[PDB]
Amino acid sequence: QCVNLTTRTQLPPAYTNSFTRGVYYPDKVFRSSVLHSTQDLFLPFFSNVTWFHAIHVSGTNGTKRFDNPVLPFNDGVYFASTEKSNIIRGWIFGTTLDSKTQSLLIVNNATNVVIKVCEFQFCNDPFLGVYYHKNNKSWMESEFRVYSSANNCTFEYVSQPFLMDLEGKQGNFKNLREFVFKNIDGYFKIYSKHTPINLVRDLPQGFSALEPLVDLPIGINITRFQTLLALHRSYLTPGDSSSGWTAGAAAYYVGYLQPRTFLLKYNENGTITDAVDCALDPLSETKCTLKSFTVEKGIYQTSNFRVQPTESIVRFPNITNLCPFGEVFNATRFASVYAWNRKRISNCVADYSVLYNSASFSTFKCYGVSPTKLNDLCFTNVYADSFVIRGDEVR
C-alpha cells in the first residue's frame, strides 16, 4: 500500500513547441546516397507539446510542483527528458488500471529492470523513494510502493544485476533522452537515443535519428499511460502521508504521432542527416515534387483543390401505402407450370428488410443487384412470377 501526499501548489500547465526531432528508421533495408520517400507515422515539425515540472526549492518564495497525472495514448507517444541525477525510472501502460484488465509495467530499482505484462492494482500516486544518511552507511537506498496486488500472468522478465549512482546534484542539466512508443498488430516497439548536453533549460534544437531497441509479442489492449517518478527524504517527521517529501530537478515532454509523408536523406555509411515534411509550408511542398533540397528561379505546379459539399438532399414521393407481399407468398393454392403465374406489383411502398432475417428462406441469390442495397435502391414495373419445380432442379 502507498500513501497520499498533499503539500504541492497550483501552477498553469502551459505548452511549448518542438523543433525538428522525431525521426526514426521505418524498416530493415539498407541504402546509401539516395533520397527516398516513405509513408508512415511521424511527429510533425514545429508542433505544440505539453511541458511538465517536478521541482521543490526554498521556503519563502519557493514552489512545490509535482506532475504525474493521467494522459491519453492515442496512436503514438513521443517522450523525452533532461536531468542530472537518475530520476523517472519507468512507465506504466494500461487501459483502466484495475485488476479486471491486464497492464504492462517497466521498473528500475537501482539493481535490475523488471518487465511484466500482467495484471495489477495501482493506487492514486505510486512512486519510488530514496533516503539520506542510511545509518547503515554507503548511503542512498530505500524502498518503493507501487502495486498492492498481483496475479499469475503470461509473460515476465528480469535483467542482469547492475550497480548505479544515486547521489543527486545541483546545476545545469548534462543529459537528455528520447523514446517513441507505437503499438501495431500485436507487437510493442521502442526506440531510444542518448546525447550529452550542456544546457541549463529547455529542449535544444538539432537532428538525430533513433534505432530500434526491443520488440515484444504482447497483443494487449492499450489506451492510457502514466509516468513514475522519484523523491528524496522528507527531512522531517510527518505521518508519512500528506507529504511529497523532496522533489528533484527534472522535466519531461509529451507529444503525439500522425500519418505524414516524408522524404529522407542518407549517406555512404548509412545514417540520416535531414528530411522535409511535404505537408509543412508551401515551399517545402515543391521540394517533395522535385526530389531535391535546392530549387531555382521559376514557376511550378504542385497539386489541385476542390470545394467540399456540406449538405445532403433526398427527394422522394410522399406516399407510404404498404403492399400485398405476404398474401402472394403465403397462398395455399398456387398454380402449375402449364400457365405462368403472373402478378404485378405497383403503387406500394415495399419493405425488403424483413425478407432477409425473418424470411427464413433456404436459397437466396440476387443477380444484377446487391442484396443488401434493395432498400436504398428503387425500381419500377416489378412483377411476381412463380412455378413449381423439383428439388434438385433449382440449379
Epitope: Q160, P161, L163, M164, D165, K174, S192, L213
Partner: T-cell receptor, first 116, second 107 residues
Framework: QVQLQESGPGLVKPSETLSLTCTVS??????????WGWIRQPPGKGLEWIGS?????????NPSLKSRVTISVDTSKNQFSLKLSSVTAADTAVYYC????????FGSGSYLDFDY | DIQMTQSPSSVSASVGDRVTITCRAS??????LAWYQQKPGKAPKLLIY???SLQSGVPSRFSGSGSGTDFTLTISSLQPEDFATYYC?????????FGGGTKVEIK
C-alpha cells in the same frame, strides 16, 4: 576506442615508491557515467581483480591486500592512479587498465563485465 | 565465498574437429556468466556474454548452453588461429573472481 595508454617505472626495490597512471583519449572521463579499474597477472598463473573506481570517489577494494591499496582520480586530465608504497614480496606481474560495460537501457553503468 | 572450477585442461585437436569445455560452480549464479580468450602476447577479448549470447561481431559458431549451476561451451570447427587460453568468470556477487583457465592447442 584506441585508448588506455599506460606508463610506469621499471625496477622498484622492496618497500619503496610504486606509481602507475593510465591515460584515456577518445571520449573523456567526466562526461561519461561508467566505472574503471585495474587487473593484475603474474607470469603464468591466472588473473585476479584488484579494484574499481568511479569518478568523484566511491572506490571498491578486494578483501585481500586491501590495506595499502588506494585509487585516486584527478579530473584535470584524463587519468587515475594507484599507490602501493610498501610492496608485497611477490607483486611482480603485468598490470592492466579496464572499463566497465554500459547498461543496455538508460545510461547507468556496471554489469560487472569489462571491455576495451 | 564463491569459487569456480574448470574440469578439463590441455585439450587438443586438429583443423577439422569439435571440442568442448565445462566450468563448474559452487552456488546459484543462475544464468550469469562470462567468458574470455587471451590470444598470446596481447590482452583478452570478451566474445560470449551472459549465457548463450554473442557480442560485437564475433566470428560466431561459439555457443554455450545455459544451465543453473554448471555451464558449458562448445565450438563446431577449428582454425589455424584459434589457439589461446580460455577463462570463465561469474557476474552475480561483488567479490568477483575468475576461474583457473584451460589451454587449447592444435597438433
Amino acid at each position: 576506442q584506441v585508448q588506455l595508454q599506460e606508463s610506469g617505472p621499471g625496477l622498484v626495490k622492496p618497500s619503496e615508491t610504486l606509481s602507475l597512471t593510465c591515460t584515456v583519449s577518445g571520449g573523456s572521463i567526466s562526461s561519461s557515467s561508467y566505472y574503471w579499474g585495474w587487473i593484475r597477472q603474474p607470469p603464468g598463473k591466472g588473473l585476479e581483480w584488484i579494484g574499481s573506481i568511479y569518478y568523484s570517489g566511491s572506490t571498491y577494494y578486494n578483501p585481500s591486500l586491501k590495506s595499502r591499496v588506494t585509487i585516486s582520480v584527478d579530473t584535470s586530465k584524463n587519468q587515475f592512479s594507484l599507490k602501493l608504497s610498501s610492496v608485497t614480496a611477490a607483486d611482480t606481474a603485468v598490470y592492466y587498465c579496464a572499463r566497465c560495460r554500459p547498461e543496455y537501457y538508460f545510461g547507468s553503468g556496471s554489469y560487472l563485465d569489462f571491455d576495451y | 565465498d564463491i569459487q569456480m572450477t574448470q574440469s578439463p585442461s590441455s585439450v587438443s585437436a586438429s583443423v577439422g574437429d569439435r571440442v568442448t569445455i565445462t566450468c563448474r560452480a559452487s552456488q546459484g549464479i543462475s544464468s550469469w556468466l562470462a567468458w574470455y580468450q587471451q590470444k598470446p602476447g596481447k590482452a583478452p577479448k570478451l566474445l560470449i556474454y551472459a549465457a548463450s549470447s554473442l557480442q560485437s561481431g564475433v566470428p560466431s559458431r561459439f555457443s554455450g548452453s545455459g544451465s543453473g549451476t554448471d555451464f558449458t561451451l562448445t565450438i563446431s570447427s577449428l582454425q589455424p588461429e584459434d589457439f589461446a587460453t580460455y577463462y570463465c568468470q561469474q557476474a552475480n556477487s561483488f567479490p568477483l573472481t575468475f576461474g583457473g583457465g584451460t589451454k587449447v592447442e592444435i597438433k
